[PDB]
Amino acid sequence: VRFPVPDDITVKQATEKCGDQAQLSCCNKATYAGDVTDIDEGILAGTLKNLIGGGSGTEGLGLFNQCSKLDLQIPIIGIPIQDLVNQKCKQNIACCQNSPSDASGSLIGLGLPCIALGSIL
DSSP, X not given: OOSOOOTTOBHHHXXXXXXXXXEEEEEEEEXXXXXXXXXXXXXXXXXXXXXXXXXXXXXXXXXXXXXXXXXXXXXXXXXXXXXXXXXXXXXXXXXXXXXXXTXXXXXXXXXXXXXXXXXXX
């Protein structure tokens, strides 16, 4: 992971940070679009930009493979538990678009389009 997620970010906070259409996912393999030439970062950035809203961090954007989604813990279930993403994950933590579109989604199923949360800070 080139852009690590702050250890003090809970799974809930991380989800809020990446937007309502994004969920944290931990992938064992990561391909960044700017690191490879056969992938157009501009296309991926276009769709992922919707999750960024306002900011810049395409340097952590690309295709993520061998990934598993992180399930949200219950926000304050009586006990004030602060479930930190780095505490349950030892894999590359990224935020993935939970919107199946036929543009930059269906015809590029070589991996999961996601962005490293550390890139959007």
